[PDB]
Design an enzyme around this catalytic site. Sequence first.
Site, PDB file in Angstrom:
ATOM      1  CB  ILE A  18      -1.100  -0.226   1.286  1.00 47.61           C
ATOM      2  CG1 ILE A  18      -1.747  -1.511   1.438  1.00 47.61           C
ATOM      3  CG2 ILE A  18      -2.049   1.046   1.049  1.00 47.61           C
ATOM      4  CD1 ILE A  18      -2.746  -1.756   0.442  1.00 47.61           C
ATOM      5  N   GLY A  21       4.020   5.770  -3.437  1.00 49.07           N
ATOM      6  CA  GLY A  21       4.128   7.280  -3.666  1.00 49.07           C
ATOM      7  C   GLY A  21       5.910   7.607  -3.943  1.00 49.07           C
ATOM      8  N   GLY A  22       6.613   6.528  -4.356  1.00 48.79           N
ATOM      9  CA  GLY A  22       8.106   6.738  -4.444  1.00 48.79           C
ATOM     10  C   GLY A  22       8.514   7.157  -3.245  1.00 48.79           C
ATOM     11  N   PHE A  23       8.277   8.299  -2.590  1.00 46.62           N
ATOM     12  CA  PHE A  23       8.848   8.876  -1.264  1.00 46.62           C
ATOM     13  C   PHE A  23       8.675   7.847  -0.251  1.00 46.62           C
ATOM     14  CB  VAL A  26       2.405   1.683   4.444  1.00 42.88           C
ATOM     15  CG1 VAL A  26       2.995   3.022   4.502  1.00 42.88           C
ATOM     16  CG2 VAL A  26       1.128   1.785   4.156  1.00 42.88           C
ATOM     17  CG  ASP A 130       1.085  18.639   8.566  1.00 44.31           C
ATOM     18  OD1 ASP A 130       0.443  17.674   8.586  1.00 44.31           O
ATOM     19  OD2 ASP A 130       1.793  19.375   7.562  1.00 44.31           O
TER      20      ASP A 130
HETATM   21  O1  LIG Z   1      -2.213  -0.387   7.874  1.00 41.00           O
HETATM   22  C1  LIG Z   1      -2.339   0.885   7.493  1.00 41.00           C
HETATM   23  N1  LIG Z   1      -3.470   1.286   6.628  1.00 41.00           N
HETATM   24  C2  LIG Z   1      -4.441   0.344   6.001  1.00 41.00           C
HETATM   25  C3  LIG Z   1      -4.389  -0.878   6.049  1.00 41.00           C
HETATM   26  C4  LIG Z   1      -5.651  -1.643   5.590  1.00 41.00           C
HETATM   27  C5  LIG Z   1      -6.528  -1.178   4.840  1.00 41.00           C
HETATM   28  C6  LIG Z   1      -6.391   0.194   4.720  1.00 41.00           C
HETATM   29  C7  LIG Z   1      -5.511   1.143   5.219  1.00 41.00           C
HETATM   30  C8  LIG Z   1      -7.410   1.147   3.701  1.00 41.00           C
HETATM   31  C9  LIG Z   1      -8.902   0.526   4.025  1.00 41.00           C
HETATM   32  N2  LIG Z   1      -9.280  -0.383   3.155  1.00 41.00           N
HETATM   33  C10 LIG Z   1      -8.094  -1.450   2.875  1.00 41.00           C
HETATM   34  C11 LIG Z   1      -7.662  -1.901   4.061  1.00 41.00           C
HETATM   35  C12 LIG Z   1      -1.685   1.937   7.745  1.00 41.00           C
HETATM   36  C13 LIG Z   1      -1.119   2.109   9.306  1.00 41.00           C
HETATM   37  C14 LIG Z   1      -0.104   3.116   9.578  1.00 41.00           C
HETATM   38  C15 LIG Z   1       0.218   3.939   8.696  1.00 41.00           C
HETATM   39  C16 LIG Z   1       1.144   4.953   9.222  1.00 41.00           C
HETATM   40  C17 LIG Z   1       1.785   4.981  10.423  1.00 41.00           C
HETATM   41  N3  LIG Z   1       2.408   6.266  10.169  1.00 41.00           N
HETATM   42  N4  LIG Z   1       2.752   6.521   8.839  1.00 41.00           N
HETATM   43  C18 LIG Z   1       1.800   5.863   8.241  1.00 41.00           C
HETATM   44  C19 LIG Z   1      -0.194   3.980   7.447  1.00 41.00           C
HETATM   45  C20 LIG Z   1      -1.134   3.132   7.098  1.00 41.00           C
HETATM   46  O2  LIG Z   1      -1.799   3.112   5.496  1.00 41.00           O
HETATM   47  C21 LIG Z   1      -1.460   4.210   4.971  1.00 41.00           C
HETATM   48  C22 LIG Z   1      -2.676   4.636   4.177  1.00 41.00           C
HETATM   49  C23 LIG Z   1      -3.400   4.001   3.086  1.00 41.00           C
HETATM   50  C24 LIG Z   1      -4.223   4.431   2.613  1.00 41.00           C
HETATM   51  C25 LIG Z   1      -5.279   5.458   3.101  1.00 41.00           C
HETATM   52  C26 LIG Z   1      -4.879   5.979   4.602  1.00 41.00           C
HETATM   53  C27 LIG Z   1      -3.524   5.548   5.075  1.00 41.00           C
END
Ligand SMILES: O=C(Nc1ccc2c(c1)CCNCC2)c1ccc(-c2cn[nH]c2)cc1OCc1ccccc1
Length: 313
Positions: A18, A21-23, A26, A130
């Site tokens: 997931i 975005g290059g930078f 996750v 932020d």
């Molecule tokens: O586990 C994380 N996110 C995540 C996990 C599963 C799913 C989704 C999202 C989207 C909903 N449907 C699909 C299931 C997840 C956890 C921590 C962090 C994180 C902690 N510090 N910096 C980043 C970022 C995460 O993601 C990034 C994200 C991706 C899409 C949108 C919103 C957020």
Amino acid sequence: GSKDYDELLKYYELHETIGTGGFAKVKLACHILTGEMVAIKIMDKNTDLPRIKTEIEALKNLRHQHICQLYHVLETANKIFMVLEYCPGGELFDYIISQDRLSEEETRVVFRQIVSAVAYVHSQGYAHRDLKPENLLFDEYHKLKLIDFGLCGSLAYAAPELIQGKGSEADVWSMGILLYVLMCGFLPFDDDNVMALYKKIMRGKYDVPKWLSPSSILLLQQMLQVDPKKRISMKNLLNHPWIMQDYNYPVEWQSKNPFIHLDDDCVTELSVHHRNNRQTMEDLISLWQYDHLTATYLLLLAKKARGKPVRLR
Ligand SMILES: O=C(Nc1ccc2c(c1)CCNCC2)c1ccc(-c2cn[nH]c2)cc1OCc1ccccc1
């Protein structure tokens, strides 16, 4: 065959990528000892260094049931790895757009978790600077966690003096922009040109729609004060009537996840896995070097509150 994913793949099983975005992207992953799902922010250092380490060193010293917890930390030759709390709920940003505007009731539950987070951050001496709804997620249990510390699209939530470079009260403004976006569905000061907005932010004049409670407007008026000394303090914010409308008892910003108290059940179990005396491991865990052992412990008592048996592999 992974040349950089050497250490990581020894402690984690990779899953669906997931965040691309290059930078940074996750990839969610499974901690094999605990069987607990985590998210791992992958960044290579070829595409800056301090801004990131300022975030990581912050997160090293903050623990709170509404900050996205940081576990292990790993730096490859040309890569860096950060494992964090599982936040499948997604951005509060999309949660806003999901149901148009948010009710005063529903906005109240979200917001009090935000203040408890931000009020704890200030106790330890940091300001997030932020604060945007794209920077707070929902965990598996709809609790709210804040990320993207970094600083310790992002201008609309910026305080007037933050553009003036002239200190924690910049977040109280940012939270006031949040709340307006929450109960309604739009920003106080947005428009297509950045020039016009600087003017509107320093002007501080914003509309007030139909549906807003007479209790809300008061609070936003006290929060959106361009005078930072006349901006409402965090102390009064925690006891304020709108914040105590229904949910009627002080915002428990006190972190219930401590750096000081080590759960026995988890440390007894952790010691039999490494063949150590329990007293020996306790002091070792209190180092909190954010290597594997810290990840194992913090996902172990997390597994405990999850209701699962407190076991490794
Ligand atoms: O586990 C994380 N996110 C995540 C996990 C599963 C799913 C989704 C999202 C989207 C909903 N449907 C699909 C299931 C997840 C956890 C921590 C962090 C994180 C902690 N510090 N910096 C980043 C970022 C995460 O993601 C990034 C994200 C991706 C899409 C949108 C919103 C957020």
